[PDB]
Design goal:
homodimer, 398 residues, 4-stranded mixed sheet, 3-stranded antiparallel sheet, 7 strands, hydrolase
Chain lengths: 398, 396
């Protein structure tokens, strides 16, 4: 029930529609040769009429912080081109807005993934956190949808794309600790490393092997620590050594080792964590929800955390209330990345039989997120298969 | 990066060697094994022993890891492979060798003569990926030549380039109907032919253009050939003028945009820079791509450079120094230089802007200081190598 303020410009005649995905809408914008910000308030349609004729127009609807803008064809192509050559002209949070809405409209069915992606390609030049983060925030859920389906080829290619994009910025991070922002941008080191960018997955191994070769006495930078452990847990000696430290020793490493422990393709170890977390003795049950969410997020262990959750639901609600923050969160972490009608009806088929235990906001919120996923992917899989098979192509004449 | 992993082989003894404390995960395929093998060079040098003897071996498979391979003793055997049976290797791997071959001409140890030889098999190359690689390895050479007074060698190269691609150039149907990359090859090969003045592509493009003009652009042009069609139309005032009328679709502009900057009309080349800057008759947000493209133009290159320096105070204000934008511009106006005089022209300008000390500048100078000595070393070798390709030399 949020806005959907369609925009059609002709010359300096700026028409704008209303469908509000009536209402009342305190539109804001920034034009091309403006270096300033403007005011307006929409009936169904209106026009405002621009003073001078200008090249591009960026509606950042002054409605609180959340708004949905659509400029259709030519309009998005004007903006796509601004970022692709002169993205510095606009701000970081406007960098975000664009990226955010570009993808919003893809799932709403007013913009095609081909185009929302044919934009993400400028991020190779983005040297700021906010847009990069946004980018990842919109692009990551796609491939996690893929991870839960027969899709190795396009998964891998997507990720290559994603890493290929970010590489420059990845490659210029010192392995140390900038401001609260630069240090957090850490996330790249991890993400690089998780996806096998090899100058990442070679130095982390180094840092890890040494660290454990002092029984974890080396001081690792905090920023690096996640990547370091994330490659560590991919080997049996790695998992075990790091897990011995978890119990034996601090507050933040905990989380970092907690996070890094679940990032394992070992189906045995994984099962272990669900199990013991459940108890409380080895891993305390105070953080079973988080462990369950992350395992759901694993590429191999997604079917475990759902299976476990179902096989032992009767006992989770005795231990975490029938419907609560934890429980809801748990429901959603083991189901909302499913992209099949086969997963959907199981997700429906389970909860719609608990009767007394069966109809919470998390249940019907999740089914929908899956019913979106089904349609989204059906529409877009084949599309994004090619958009990537049509990107690594002359990625210079005369 | 830039580890240089030297490979010497005697029988089954396969010696690595290292260059710039590196740890290097090595991978390799042979004439016996299609399988990508594994080897971790952690020490400076090492060896391995292949199970049986091999006609050839090749390292860094599919270009997955960042190391460049030079084959000692070697390269000769990898050539004859591609010259006789290139279908035995894979497509991505055909690219590797072309990249590397020419790469190692950068740093030496491999002569231009031998790298250029390798590129000869492309006469039979029936796949997007290697074709492209060969183009974008060879092209940046005659781009360096265009910016000097080496016409006879420039033209001789260019013809060569075409002669090389020709059989495949004539194979493209002037339509769309194709899968991905299939349609991209026609896209790009028709252009190349046309720009280098291959007549059968220049004559077809004049026709398509001509009849399109005789319709007020109401003629159906296939997307692929559109570039070539326009690329040759803008070589006359009636065609440049016409296309701009059309300029003022989301993709049509880009072709007409590109096709415009090809004109050797240094008068209207100026007009594009000037009016792109204003933002009125062409967008301001498009000055980066028009400046970089005028950079490449064999006759207009000086303007785009000249315009930048004469007008640098308004671009740094308009787009902000140290941007994606400004760096792209600096490097596109200057990276194809290949003389000492041009060097001091770069160093002289940018360093005098007081605070100058940013990536592109430091980056460009390095790119030109590498050009200079590349050309010193290679121009003559290439001059004479060309004089020999033409040698069909069929006896008995």
């Amino acid at each position: 029930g949020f806005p959907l303020i369609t925009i059609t410009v002709r010359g300096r005649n700026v028409h704008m529609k209303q469908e509000h995905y009536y209402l009342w809408v305190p539109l804001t914008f920034i034009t091309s040769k403006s270096d300033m910000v403007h005011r307006f308030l929409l009936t169904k349609t209106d026009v405002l009429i621009l003073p001078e004729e200008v090249e591009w127009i960026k509606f950042n609807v002054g409605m609180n912080g959340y708004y949905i803008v659509h400029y259709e064809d030519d309009g998005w192509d004007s903006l796509t081109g601004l970022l692709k050559g002169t993205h510095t002209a606009v701000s970081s949070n406007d960098r975000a807005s664009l990226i955010n809405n570009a993808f919003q409209l893809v799932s709403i069915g007013k913009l095609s993934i081909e185009k929302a992606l044919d934009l993400s390609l400028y991020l190779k030049h983005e040297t700021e956190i906010m847009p990069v983060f946004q980018g990842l925030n919109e692009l990551i859920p796609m491939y996690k949808l893929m991870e839960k389906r027969d899709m190795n080829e396009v998964e891998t290619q997507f990720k290559a794309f994603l890493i290929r994009l970010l590489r420059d910025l990845i490659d210029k991070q010192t392995w140390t600790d900038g401001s609260v922002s630069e240090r957090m941008l850490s996330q790249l080191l991890l993400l690089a490393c998780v996806h096998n960018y090899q100058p990442c997955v070679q130095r982390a191994e180094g840092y890890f092997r040494k660290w454990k070769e002092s029984n974890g006495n080396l001081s690792l930078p905090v920023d690096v620590t996640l990547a370091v452990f994330a490659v560590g847990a991919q080997s049996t000696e790695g998992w075990d050594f790091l897990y011995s430290k978890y119990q034996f020793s601090s507050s933040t490493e905990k989380s970092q080792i907690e996070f890094a422990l679940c990032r394992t393709q070992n189906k045995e170890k994984l099962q272990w964590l669900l199990d013991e977390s459940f108890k409380g003795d080895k891993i305390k049950t105070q953080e079973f929800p988080q462990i369950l969410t992350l395992i759901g997020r694993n590429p191999v262990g997604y079917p475990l955390a759902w299976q476990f959750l179902r096989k032992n639901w009767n006992k989770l609600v005795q231990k975490f209330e029938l419907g609560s923050s934890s429980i809801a969160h748990m429901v959603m972490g083991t189901t909302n990345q499913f992209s099949t009608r086969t997963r959907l009806e199981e997700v429906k088929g389970f909860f719609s039989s608990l009767k007394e235990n069966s109809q919470l906001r998390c249940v019907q919120q999740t089914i929908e997120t899956i019913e979106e996923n089904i349609g989204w992917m059906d529409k877009n899989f084949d599309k994004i298969r090619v958009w990537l098979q049509s990107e690594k192509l002359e990625r210079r004449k005369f």
